[PDB]
Amino acid sequence: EELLMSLKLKALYPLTGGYNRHSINPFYEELVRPTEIKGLWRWWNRVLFNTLAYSTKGKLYTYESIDRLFEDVFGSENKKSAVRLEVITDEGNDNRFELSYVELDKVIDCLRNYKRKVSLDFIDNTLIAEIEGSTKIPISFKSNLDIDKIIKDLVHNNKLLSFELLGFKSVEIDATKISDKKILKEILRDLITNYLEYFNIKQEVTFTLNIYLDKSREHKQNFEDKLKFALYSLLVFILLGGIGRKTSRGFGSLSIIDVKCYDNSICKKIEDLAKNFLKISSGNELKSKIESILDCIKNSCIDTLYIENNILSEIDPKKNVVYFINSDLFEVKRINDKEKVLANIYKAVSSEGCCIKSIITDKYVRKSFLIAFGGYRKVEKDKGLDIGFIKNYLCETCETVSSFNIVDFLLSEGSFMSDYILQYEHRNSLLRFKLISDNSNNSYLIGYILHSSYFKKIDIKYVRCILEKLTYCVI
Amino acid sequence: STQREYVFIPITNSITIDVKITIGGSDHITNIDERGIHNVLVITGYAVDEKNGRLVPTLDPCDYVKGILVAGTPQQAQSNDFLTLKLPANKLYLIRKKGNISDDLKIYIPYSSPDARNSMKTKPVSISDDTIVNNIIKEVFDKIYNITQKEKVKIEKVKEDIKELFSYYALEQ
Amino acid sequence: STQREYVFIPITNSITIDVKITIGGSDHITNIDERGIHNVLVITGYAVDEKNGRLVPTLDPCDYVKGILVAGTPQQAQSNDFLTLKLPANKLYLIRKKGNISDDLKIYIPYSSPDARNSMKTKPVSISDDTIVNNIIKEVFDKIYNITQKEKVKIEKVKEDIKELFSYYALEQ
Amino acid sequence: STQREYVFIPITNSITIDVKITIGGSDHITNIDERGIHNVLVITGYAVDEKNGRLVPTLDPCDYVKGILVAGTPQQAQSNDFLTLKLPANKLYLIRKKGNISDDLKIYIPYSSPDARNSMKTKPVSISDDTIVNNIIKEVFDKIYNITQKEKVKIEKVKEDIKELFSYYALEQ
Amino acid sequence: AIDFLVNILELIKEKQCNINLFSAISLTSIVYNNFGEFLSNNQSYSTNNPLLKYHIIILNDKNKTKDVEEKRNIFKREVAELISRNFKLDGEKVRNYFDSLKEVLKSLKYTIVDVEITTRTRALIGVSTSLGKLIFGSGISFDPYMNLPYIPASEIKGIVRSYIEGKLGEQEAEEIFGNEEREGNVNFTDAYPTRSKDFLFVPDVITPHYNGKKSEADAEPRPVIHLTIAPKVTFRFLIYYKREDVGKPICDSMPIILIRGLGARSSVGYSLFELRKIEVIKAA
């Protein structure tokens, strides 16, 4: 109904995925998805609201209830969102992946009558097609995307990227039975498209995020303050999070370039508070700015005015898991090189990475630490190391030598939180890294640890200087 | 020429007189205005020397010590054991920064010899036991902040933050 | 010939003394008779200048300003600042018509230069705080239509349509 | 900072002497990039005055004039006819929005007084008769957009649209 | 017969604008919903049917039902890509239709206002309509006799009317569009795509993670591949009436309301349109 604000943002190495899990496809290119911005805005808003509610009332509310409270700005099944997002990526005209030709009919030869796995690899600057049947044919091809020779190295060096590249790299072709040449050609052609689209990674995607506001949706009960809180949540999203895939590991990190209010009475305390990030001389200044914004919303800003509404719902402790910001855990270091930083994040977050190996020993707590702060991992009861030891370093009863005890994680008595921590595959990582830049050529590595609700009053002191050590070793 | 002096907040009696000047100019770095302490400073790697209160250099980044940057220089019986320092106000790890700085500060640190005959096993210590808290309400927050009980009738609020903010690591030998 | 003056209807009223004619001719365009106001005109691509409000030519088609037409040339210290047009009674954006005109009618609207020294960032405005409705009843709907409260006791329906028939875009700066 | 000129596109050769600058800055709002026009600006409520063609304000939303935004200042032979204005780059109705904006732009549109001595009843006009299209390529797309003849051999790409997009209204009086 | 079903994909690839897309998608939905069965030596043993390659790919040799599940997901994506690539726009029948209808309306002494609008982003019109509903769980408003996607006249009228409400009041909105006691004065046709730069449909995805979810323990992506209307597709529709003093609001309302959305999920900037042209023909 009317333009509210306009934010020129900048994402570094976004890993946006579309229907094919890539930023480009045969039909269009899309580096920034407005639906992802909306979803991450709502996710950060819920994190920020539980942060607030816990820094005043010590209470934590379900995501359902939080979004039911904010459904006047973000909309729900019962009400249309009052805010309309409009991404404008400059240069965002028609671009798509076109495979002008690929010179197979030699790979098809060495494939027939067999059952082989056709692996690919794009380093050496020429696409080779490894075959586990012991042959490596170099493939000639012409595409529309020009992999800049920096992207090949960024993918070959980053152990996380080259890991998530296993899924876009191979097919197990079975030509034992009736197998013409044409359909094998299309199979390998789509495999090559799926592999090449993965390398559409650009550095410094720059877009303009407009926000429109429906005024017709009146100040029903607490619209203005809900909206201000949502705009603060959007700023916190732009400051602490990124867009796209693996934002917990620095990719897609956002950075402000320009903010412009158009309705002072609502946002003129976000306009300047984001101007507070167009120039960041040192790391300490940035950490101070972040603590400033974080504290502002904590006590000084709006109030408990709408938390007094009886629509929220306190979380069950043993059946729910919510996240919230902890102001203490906000290490900042100057970057001097972004690609190497992203590659060292793996040293930070891998159980055999030579930074957490040099910050944590006994390996058990190490596993434990990552299992509690590195999202889901695939541990299985086969060779003892899981037996008891890591179960011990997570008991909420039973000792205090580990500074982190999961709420209902029980010794052989796993009911819900045990399976959630050890089996639930889709678990975000609490330890997160981000990279920021300003209008100057200053770049900083934030490393933070979101506070979760399955920690039984974690020792905020041990993990705090674990985080400075990690942030040092990876920069 | 504007200088300052870093004074730490331990749980012992080594603060009441350490410096000459308290006002010097017209505005302290740390302020207490209607919300509590601000512009607190933290130095990372030093531990307290409560017996003959000073700071000792440790190479541990996990080690840190709180303090306030008060205007002044120590008592003119000094300048042989104090890490005075020139900084462009962005090497300073402030806390709750309110206003912009002059981008150059000289700081007198209470510095101690590395006392190279004992391993520096430092224990973490917080500040509690309101006996000494009410001691420091006026022994350290009145001679410098005579704003106490004149405009800040809320000097419980200047406690409302020391309950949580200040903490350190001490040798305790 | 025929001549009318378009009067803005914002929530900010220098609407008092800018033109002359109150009766002028045997007939007017905008009527308020038994069913609400009639023949309200709307101008798109413009915004009011609420401080001593005049119509400011923007060029965004979204920005619009509604007002009513009453005969008269403005205070005749003018022909330098107000816009003079001559339209055939069918290009007009009349809202809530009852009867049309002689197919040639001259319009005076409060005009000004678009002031190319400021970012004309407009904002939408409605008419609420019915005290404002009462003062505009007193300021044009009494000056021009003093027929009200002597002939028309339909004040409820001319109150409920002001909040309905008039909403505009202002500069707010 | 940044300023542009609005060059409307009538059938008339009356739009030759409209310029003072070729590029001036480092950018033109309108683009002709291997697909035709881009970022075309519409102004509604205005009819062209092909009698020494400029824009004349009307009070009809069905009247509108399309054109382009070239960078520069008008002629130095102005301050009586054109209307300069500063808008935050989102209050422009841009046909075929290709890129982004800078959020505040100063613009000059060729304005003419409404000339309230004849009923200003205007009628639509579409630009047909491609010989005028092939010579308006010469006039406006070879004096400013000399990319024509430089890289872009597909100038029929813009013939197809000048014969199909840049329509307008005209007083025809 | 069943051979129709095993060949429907070949027919899609080889006709590309001349089969009924509605019934074609309805039929290939049977293949999609019996995928595991159409892959048990019941592919008719052809050589062009895309069902062949799903016997050549080995996704999980351990468990066969998981393998069929992944093959089915791949096939859903492949059907989306097939429709988006092969089914393209031939909007000459549409220009003929609108020109003939314009002549009809001129003979009935109407004032016609023909409007061309181009989509700027990927549009979603009729997301709850049946087209691909039995494959994608999402639809597009599709005329199965024009064999084209379209924008219903009722949606265009409703959006224009809600804007005219929000601007000129409910009373003027009813003076133009009528109420339960007076009929409207303005008629709208459906909007059909007359021209495009490229693909008419394109694939897309929506992946709710935290939609109606208690906590992060409930979090899980559920991706939804679906079809959308590609950008740069031009639609055309008519607006005709008799009373002249109703063209002014229409004129004003059209350029604005299309900037804001026109189909589904405009809140995240999907169904945005540009006003390409507006011609008015007064009955003389």
Chains B and A touch (3+ CB pairs under 8 A): yes
Question: With helix as H, strand as E and coil as C, how does B121-171 read?
Answer: CCEEEECCCHHHHHHHHHHCCCCCCCCECCCECCCCHHHHCCCCCCEEEEC
Strands A253-261 and E273-281: unpaired
Any residues with CB less than 8 A from the CB of B11 and at least 6 apart, and which?
A: B50, B125, B127, B129, B132, B170
Handedness of CA C44, C49, C53, C54 (dihedral sign): negative
Residue E244 carries which DSSP code? S
Does C143 lie at the interface with E, CB-CB under 8 angstroms?
A: no
Contact check, Cβ <8 Å, E214/A62: yes
Contact check, Cβ <8 Å, A284/B35: no
Contact check, Cβ <8 Å, A321/E213: no
Contact check, Cβ <8 Å, A208/D100: yes
Q: Where is D135: in which H helix or E strand?
A: helix D130-141
Closest-CA residue of chain A to D104: A260
Beta bridge partners of E158: none
Measure Cα distances from A170 to A131, A438, E115 in Å. Answer: 10, 40, 50
Any residues with CB less than 8 A from the CB of E50 and at least 6 apart, and which?
A: E9, E75, E78, E82
Spell out which residues of chain D touch residue A6, defining contact as CB-CB under 8 Å.
Answer: 90, 103
Neighbour count for residue A151 (Cβ, 10 Å):
20
Q: In this structure, what token pair is assigned to residue C149? A: 């409260």
Structural contact between residues C52 and C14, judged by C-beta atoms closer than 8 angstroms: yes
Contact check, Cβ <8 Å, A6/D98: no
Structural contact between residues A285 and A442, judged by C-beta atoms closer than 8 angstroms: no
Of B29, B36, B42, give the one whose Cα is nearest residue B69.
B29
Phi/psi at B29 (nearest 5 deg)? -65, -60
Shortest Cα distance from D105 to chain C (angstroms)?
8
Does C164 lie at the interface with A, CB-CB under 8 angstroms?
A: no
Greatest alpha-carbon pair distance for chain E in Å reads 77
Phi/psi at E220 (nearest 5 deg)? -165, 135
Strands C123-125 and D46-48: unpaired
CA distance between the termini of chain D: 39
d(CA B85, CA B108): 7
Q: What angle do helix axes E153-177 and C155-165 make, rounded to 10 degrees?
A: 150
Of C82, C77, C75, C80, give the one whose Cα is nearest residue C8.
C82
Q: Touching D: which chains, 3+ CB pairs < 8 A?
A: A, C, E
Closest CB to C93: pick one of E169, E175, E248.
Answer: E248
Shortest Cα distance from E22 to chain A (angstroms)?
22
Among D34, D100, D103, D105, the strongest candidate for a mutation testing the A interface, having the largest count of A CBs within 10 A, is: D100
d(CA B112, CA B170): 13
Which position has the token pair 């009436």? E241
Structural contact between residues A12 and A255, judged by C-beta atoms closer than 8 angstroms: yes
Does A380 lie at the interface with C, CB-CB under 8 angstroms?
A: no
Any residues with CB less than 8 A from the CB of A356 and at least 6 apart, and which?
A: A347, A348, A349, A350, A366, A369, A370, A470
Overall residue count recorded for chain A in this entry: 475
Judged by phi (left if over 0) then psi (alpha if -120 to 50, else beta), residue A171 lies in beta
Does D96 lie at the interface with E, CB-CB under 8 angstroms?
A: yes
d(CA E16, CA E89): 9
Counting the structural domains of chain B, the total is 1
Structural contact between residues E252 and E219, judged by C-beta atoms closer than 8 angstroms: no
Contact check, Cβ <8 Å, C42/E168: yes
Q: Touching C: which chains, 3+ CB pairs < 8 A?
A: A, D, E
CA A280 from centroid of its chain's CA atoms? 24
CA E24 from centroid of its chain's CA atoms? 15
Shortest Cα distance from B50 to chain A (angstroms)?
22
Residue E257 carries which DSSP code? H
Closest CB to D90: pick one of A3, A91, A93.
Answer: A3
Spell out which residues of chain C touch residue D83, defining contact as CB-CB under 8 Å.
Answer: 57, 113-114
Spell out which residues of chain C touch residue D116, defining contact as CB-CB under 8 Å.
Answer: 84-86, 106
Any residues with CB less than 8 A from the CB of A53 and at least 6 apart, and which?
A: A59, A60, A61, A307, A312
Shortest Cα distance from A252 to chain D (angstroms)?
21
State whether residue A120 is helix, strand or coil: strand
Query: In degrees to the nearest 10, what's the CA dihedral of E225, E227, E230, E234?
Result: -160
d(CA A176, CA A208): 53
Question: With helix as H, strand as E and coil as C, how does A385-426 read?
Answer: CHHHHHHHCCCCCCCCCCCCCECCCCCCCCCCHHHHHHCCCC
d(CA A7, CA A257): 7
Any residues with CB less than 8 A from the CB of E237 and at least 6 apart, and which?
A: E114, E115, E117, E151, E153, E156, E188, E189, E190, E191, E192
Spell out which residues of chain A touch residue D94, defining contact as CB-CB under 8 Å.
Answer: none
Closest-CA residue of chain E to C65: E167
Contact check, Cβ <8 Å, D60/E255: no
Shortest Cα distance from E251 to chain C (angstroms)?
11
**Number of residue pairs across C and D with CB atoms under 8 Å?**
98
Q: Where is C159: in which H helix or E strand?
A: helix C155-165
Measure Cα distances from A10 to A94, A258, E171 in Å. Answer: 21, 10, 47
Of E235, E276, E206, E220, give the one whose Cα is nearest residue E141.
E235
d(CA A134, CA B119): 61
Phi/psi at D37 (nearest 5 deg)? -65, 160
Shortest Cα distance from E277 to chain D (angstroms)?
7
Beta bridge partners of B111: B55
d(CA B78, CA B19): 9
Structural contact between residues B165 and B44, judged by C-beta atoms closer than 8 angstroms: no
Of E76, B141, D79, give the one whose Cα is nearest residue A19.
E76
Contact check, Cβ <8 Å, B91/A284: yes
Handedness of CA C22, C24, C26, C32 (dihedral sign): negative
Contact check, Cβ <8 Å, E171/C90: no
Q: How many CA atoms lie within 13 A of A465 on its CB side?
A: 9
Contact check, Cβ <8 Å, C123/A2: yes
Q: How many CA atoms lie within 13 A of E253 on its CB side?
A: 23
- The experimental method is cryo-EM
**Full residue range of the structural domain in which residue B64 is found:** 1-173
Q: In this structure, what token pair is assigned to residue D18? A: 């409209």
Does D97 lie at the interface with E, CB-CB under 8 angstroms?
A: yes
Any residues with CB less than 8 A from the CB of B16 and at least 6 apart, and which?
A: B139, B140, B143
Contact check, Cβ <8 Å, E280/D61: no
Spell out which residues of chain C touch residue D93, defining contact as CB-CB under 8 Å.
Answer: 59-61
Amino acid letter for position D81? D
Strands D105-109 and D3-8: parallel
Q: Touching E: which chains, 3+ CB pairs < 8 A?
A: A, C, D
Does D123 lie at the interface with E, CB-CB under 8 angstroms?
A: no
Amino acid letter for position D159? K
**Number of residue pairs across A and E with CB atoms under 8 Å?**
126
Contact check, Cβ <8 Å, B91/A281: no
Among C64, C120, C121, the strongest candidate for a mutation testing the A interface, having the largest count of A CBs within 10 A, is: C121
Neighbour count for residue A265 (Cβ, 10 Å):
10
Does D80 lie at the interface with C, CB-CB under 8 angstroms?
A: no
Chains E and B touch (3+ CB pairs under 8 A): no
Chains C and B touch (3+ CB pairs under 8 A): no
Overall residue count recorded for chain D in this entry: 173
Breaks (C-N over 2.5 A) in chain A follow: none
Closest CB to D61: pick one of E120, E251, E275.
Answer: E251
DSSP secondary structure of C32-43: E-SSSEE-EEEE
Residue A112 carries which DSSP code? T
Q: Touching B: which chains, 3+ CB pairs < 8 A?
A: A
Chains C and A touch (3+ CB pairs under 8 A): yes
Residue A298 carries which DSSP code? I
Provide the strand spans (E) within chain E.
Answer: 111-119, 142-143, 148-149, 186-188, 192-196, 201-206, 224-229, 233-241, 273-281
Amino acid letter for position A197? E
Of E253, E251, E259, give the one whose Cα is nearest residue E278.
E251
DSSP secondary structure of B54-116: -EEE-S-TT-EEEEEEES---TTS-SSSEEEEEE-SSSS-EES--S---S-EEEEEEB----T
Q: What angle do helix axes E153-177 and E247-259 make, rounded to 10 degrees?
A: 140
Does C150 lie at the interface with A, CB-CB under 8 angstroms?
A: no
Q: How many CA atoms lie within 13 A of B25 on its CB side?
A: 12
Spell out which residues of chain E touch residue D95, defining contact as CB-CB under 8 Å.
Answer: 274-276
d(CA C27, CA C31): 9
d(CA B119, CA B142): 37
Spell out which residues of chain A touch residue D100, defining contact as CB-CB under 8 Å.
Answer: 88, 90, 208
Of B63, B68, B93, give the one whose Cα is nearest residue B143.
B68
Does A298 lie at the interface with B, CB-CB under 8 angstroms?
A: no
Amino acid letter for position C78? Q
Shortest Cα distance from D34 to chain A (angstroms)?
12
CA distance between the termini of chain C: 38
Measure Cα distances from A394 to A45, A265, A412 in Å. Answer: 29, 49, 12
